[PDB]
Amino acid sequence: RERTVRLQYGSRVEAVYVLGTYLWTDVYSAAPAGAQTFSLKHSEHVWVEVVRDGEAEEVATNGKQRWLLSPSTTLRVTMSQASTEASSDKVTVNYYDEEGSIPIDQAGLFLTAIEISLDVDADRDGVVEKNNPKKASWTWGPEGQGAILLVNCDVYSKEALKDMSQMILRTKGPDRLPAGYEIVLYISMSDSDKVGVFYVENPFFGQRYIHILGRRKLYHVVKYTGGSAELLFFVEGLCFPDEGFSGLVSIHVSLLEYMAQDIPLTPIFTDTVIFRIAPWIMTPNILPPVSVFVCCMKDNYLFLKEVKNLVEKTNCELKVCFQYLNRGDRWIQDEIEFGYIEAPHKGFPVVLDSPRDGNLELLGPDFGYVTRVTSLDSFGNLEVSPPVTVNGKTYPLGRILIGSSFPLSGGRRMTKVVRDFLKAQQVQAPVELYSDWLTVGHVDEFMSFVPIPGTKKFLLLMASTSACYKLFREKQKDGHGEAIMFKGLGGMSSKRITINKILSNESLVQENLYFQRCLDWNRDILKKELGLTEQDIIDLPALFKMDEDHRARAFFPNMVNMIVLDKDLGIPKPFGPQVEEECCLEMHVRGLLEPLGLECTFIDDISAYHKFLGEVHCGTNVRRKPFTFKWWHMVPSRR
Amino acid sequence: RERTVRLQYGSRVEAVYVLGTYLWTDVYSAAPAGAQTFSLKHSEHVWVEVVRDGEAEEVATNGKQRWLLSPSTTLRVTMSQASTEASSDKVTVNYYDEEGSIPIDQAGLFLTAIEISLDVDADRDGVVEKNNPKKASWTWGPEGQGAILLVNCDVYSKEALKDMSQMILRTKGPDRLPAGYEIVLYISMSDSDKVGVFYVENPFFGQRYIHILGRRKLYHVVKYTGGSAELLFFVEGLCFPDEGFSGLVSIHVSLLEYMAQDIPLTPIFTDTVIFRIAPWIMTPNILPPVSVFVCCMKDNYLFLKEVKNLVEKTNCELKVCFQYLNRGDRWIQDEIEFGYIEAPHKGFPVVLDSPRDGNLELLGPDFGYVTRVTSLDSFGNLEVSPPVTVNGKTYPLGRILIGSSFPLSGGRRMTKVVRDFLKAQQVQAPVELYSDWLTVGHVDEFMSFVPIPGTKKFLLLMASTSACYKLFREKQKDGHGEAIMFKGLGGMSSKRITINKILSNESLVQENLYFQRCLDWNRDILKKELGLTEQDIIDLPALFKMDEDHRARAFFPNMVNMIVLDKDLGIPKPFGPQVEEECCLEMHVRGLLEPLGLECTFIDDISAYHKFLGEVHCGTNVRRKPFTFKWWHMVPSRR
Numbered sequence A, B: 001r002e003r004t005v006r007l008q009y010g011s012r013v014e015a016v017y018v019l020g021t022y023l024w025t026d027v028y029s030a031a032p033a034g035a036q037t038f039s040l041k042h043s044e045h046v047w048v049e050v051v052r053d054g055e056a057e058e059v060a061t062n063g064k065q066r067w068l069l070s071p072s073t074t075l076r077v078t079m080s081q082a083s084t085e086a087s088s089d090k091v092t093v094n095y096y097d098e099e100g101s102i103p104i105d106q107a108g109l110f111l112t113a114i115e116i117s118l119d120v121d122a123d124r125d126g127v128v129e130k131n132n133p134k135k136a137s138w139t140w141g142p143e144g145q146g147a148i149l150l151v152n153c154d155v156y157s158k159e160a161l162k163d164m165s166q167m168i169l170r171t172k173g174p175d176r177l178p179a180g181y182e183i184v185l186y187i188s189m190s191d192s193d194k195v196g197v198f199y200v201e202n203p204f205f206g207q208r209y210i211h212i213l214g215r216r217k218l219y220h221v222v223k224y225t226g227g228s229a230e231l232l233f234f235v236e237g238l239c240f241p242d243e244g245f246s247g248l249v250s251i252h253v254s255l256l257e258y259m260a261q262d263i264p265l266t267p268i269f270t271d272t273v274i275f276r277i278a279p280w281i282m283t284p285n286i287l288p289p290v291s292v293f294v295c296c297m298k299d300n301y302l303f304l305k306e307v308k309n310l311v312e313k314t315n316c317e318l319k320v321c322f323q324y325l326n327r328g329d330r331w332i333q334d335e336i337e338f339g340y341i342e343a344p345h346k347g348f349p350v351v352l353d354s355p356r357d358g359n360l361e362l363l364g365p366d367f368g369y370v371t372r373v374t375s376l377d378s379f380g381n382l383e384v385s386p387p388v389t390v391n392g393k394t395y396p397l398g399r400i401l402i403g404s405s406f407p408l409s410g411g412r413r414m415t416k417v418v419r420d421f422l423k424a425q426q427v428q429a430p431v432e433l434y435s436d437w438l439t440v441g442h443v444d445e446f447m448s449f450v451p452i453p454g455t456k457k458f459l460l461l462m463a464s465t466s467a468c469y470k471l472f473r474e475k476q477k478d479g480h481g482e483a484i485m486f487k488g489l490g491g492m493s494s495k496r497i498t499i500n501k502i503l504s505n506e507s508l509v510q511e512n513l514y515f516q517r518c519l520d521w522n523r524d525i526l527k528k529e530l531g532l533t534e535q536d537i538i539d540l541p542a543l544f545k546m547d548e549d550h551r552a553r554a555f556f557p558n559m560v561n562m563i564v565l566d567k568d569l570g571i572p573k574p575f576g577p578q579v580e581e582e583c584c585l586e587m588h589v590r591g592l593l594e595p596l597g598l599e600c601t602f603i604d605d606i607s608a609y610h611k612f613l614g615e616v617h618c619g620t621n622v623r624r625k626p627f628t629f630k631w632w633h634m635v636p637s638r639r
């Protein structure tokens, strides 16, 4: 960067020189009228070139050389090291008329050189490198650079600031700035609700970290100390990317020059760093489980016992939660979603919370928490795929899936605020599915993903009414038509539901043909947007009843919504027709999954209620390890 | 795209097949219970593969081949040509039990194949090509594709729609769609205020073009005609890109299937095209002039005469406008900005209008018009550079420059709405300068650009107080100190302003040293952001007086704001000190510019007022030819 500094005659100009710039210096304006030539001297640590027309020549500290005075003959002045108390850094120009060789006047330039750099970890290794040349930009991908900020998901103490990003103002210079200069850190009004910055204003008096930039504070004057100094700041993000906020914020430092009273200070030098606030990222079922969270009523004993036995087969821990006045019976699934954020220096799991009635809980200090209508707003209506490649385009973090209705239908849709939030995170590139054919309207009622043990591959599991009818028709042909469903549920007994009773119900057949069309519409979108073929899909038998809105609810428990812990699957117990004293639905599902090395455990969540009307009274959610792939290595499509 | 279609037994499924897709077909669900094997027949134009486990084999129209019934054995069904009235397109599956070789049941699939494609000019040649594979995306650059829409800047007539973009729905098929299908064109609610779409709904009754999509109309059912048909639509943009609008809009067509009463129609097939709305683009002084627009009071005779003589030296046309009650004296410069928009098929100049008091004119049908506070909001405070390359980064359309104040100053700034509009056009990548040291606060008071004749290069012209003081001090040394300014302006005479009187005014010297600092701050930003060196800059003598706000107004007319018509420059007449009966300011300026092949004509806009107090009462603006470089060939940085 070249900067303009002009001489003024009979006199001296004093200026601060910031390393990394250079000065171009007009010597002609300060020449007395009628002067013809000029000569110059300079000190050891100032480099001076005479530039005539654009041709530059280095000039010695004390030569006698003279040049013609011309507007097109100027000086270029460079310094490679900061001034100290031992410095006298200067350039002096003498002017001559035609008459003789003794100077008729002289104009000086007295310089104080300082280093000023606002530094961040732009190369994304967790250390704050010195003046990264790319620190003022932010680029995606393996070769990308620029600093990363975490949203704070929770006078201050240093220990509390350990999660934040470091920003260091590094300076070098003499004991003090020359008269009339100050250094100021600042942000835009727009960015003021996106960030906050802390530091210790008075280190002589203690370690107290104070908030110096943020809401209502757009600038902070910083104290200059001489020699080589560093000021350590901590920076936090205040919010995630959203519809109107890209995720990018900037922080500036300027050296300002005092002009006079009632005149703004002049920005002599400005340095800028950019941060991107890390997005919230969802974890698919293929990622290693850490903890399993369940909620149910205290007396659903079978559910608790069987979930405990499932989890005991794994290395996961179980966390048991009961029911709360402000929350639905499924809240750990519906009102809570486990996700994470990551920066080069650190990362943590982050839970999104959307309580049914609003807040009045939480599990653990280890998580960050973000707290916020139709049933489509539930997190049961949100899923995320394993990493996929689609027509050459890779989604290394997978893609988020959200249930919706058809564009022209006038049906339900998840609220714009949530849809826009998910879209703005960018790295999971969400896809809308069709859930509005279901009374409750959640994608988790019809689909899930499971890893294939011993491989890096996965399966999509789809509810299928067609598979259920085929199975029941086979068992009827085999002489089992009188086999009864719901054995052991006393509140169902008087209905005497048998395979025969189901197969002879004409309207129910028609309803379920229609529901299969809805499932297949989803199947096609999933194959398209996830790059899946028929070999990647398994169909689990399912059956629904229709309401007055022509929407589906489960006839028997939906097996697709299962607890996935690697090879081990907690599968809702279906209570299907018994053949040879085994549920034909359980046997069929085992025959599909077990050959792939998946281990099935059926979990009874409904017996405690004595009947099943389509509603499930328990919920589960699994906290998983984050992806090994760093989100900042992705190259998302430009919006 | 693979689509799911299942057979149903004892019976027939009828389906529409859209060319470009294929069907995967479950034959197992329709098998009677206890059936073992299946065979198939099909018609000549339907291609059928039996896919077992993922291994596919082509099957003849009538073979006797049998396969085991399995859920993992399916059909893949393809058609390469649309159905006609002569078509019977079908696949029939026979089922067998173990017992014998005579079919126990059969399930058919009856198909009607149609072509449906929503087509636009995505390859950007002005013609609407057939089904561009990239039409659903929009990419920048020489190799980029996707369609371009113009904002409309002005029952309907076809002639009025000639400027709009064409979109053509191309279909092929038999006399009618099968029962229960319709084709619907649609847009999102969000896009509904960004676009409008027209067509002739009833071509049997006349040519009337009606608005079918836009505000309050999100969908339109289109009539299907058989054979090969095209429906021609015209599409207009309603607004330019802005803070919350990227410029991208989408239009969809869907084939919908009727399910039953009170159930939404199912989207069987959807095709999508994307448009980008073309940005408003500003023209720098290096572009060929077409017309010169001037405004002044009717009796400023010298101005009109001299501007006419200037324009007569060129091939440009002159347009003379007077003063209006709702507008300032400079309005053609301050309230009007000439720009253009372009699409592959066509382009036109587009004027932005921001009337001082609001609207109550316009010049010509040839222009589009866009009509909308401090003095920084004026278009005198907007300039655009010639094309530049900066540190390897090219700006082929140049960069817009807007005057502002320092970030921490609390000073004036152009309104956010205008700043955000300019930023959203993206292709001119605006730069903020510092104009707030001037009372009026316009960049055109201190800077301009001129082409260097006979070359592709250009110069930045900067006002310089330092150049004026040097010149006046020289003339004083030469014995001309008593030379008077403002000769011939009777209202100035009693002041007796001479070079001596100016040079002895101590406070004025100090004021102008400060103004030179302001100019130099701008010089440095311009060199940085435009990639300019000192060789690219010429300094024109200028002088200012300071107001109580410490802001500058011209002491004598600012020569930098000049009419640039290629080699010929209309330069405000300065009324400087006369030496040997020539203005020393005019002679100095000629000595700077003329050697470069620039021809200077000085234009007197102030004599009619008898004095000069810092205010100019005339304005000029030049309409120029657009850049030859197509804006869509640029690759702007991602936001």
Ligand SMILES: [Ca+2]
Binding pocket: A120, A121, A122, A123, A124, A125, A126, A127, A128, A129
């Ligand atoms: Ca680093």
Ligand SMILES: [Ca+2]
Binding pocket: A333, A337, A379, A380, A381, A382, A383, A444
């Ligand atoms: Ca979920």
Ligand SMILES: [Ca+2]
Binding pocket: B120, B121, B122, B123, B124, B125, B126, B127, B128, B129
């Ligand atoms: Ca074309």
Ligand SMILES: [Ca+2]
Binding pocket: B333, B337, B379, B380, B381, B382, B383, B444
């Ligand atoms: Ca302008």
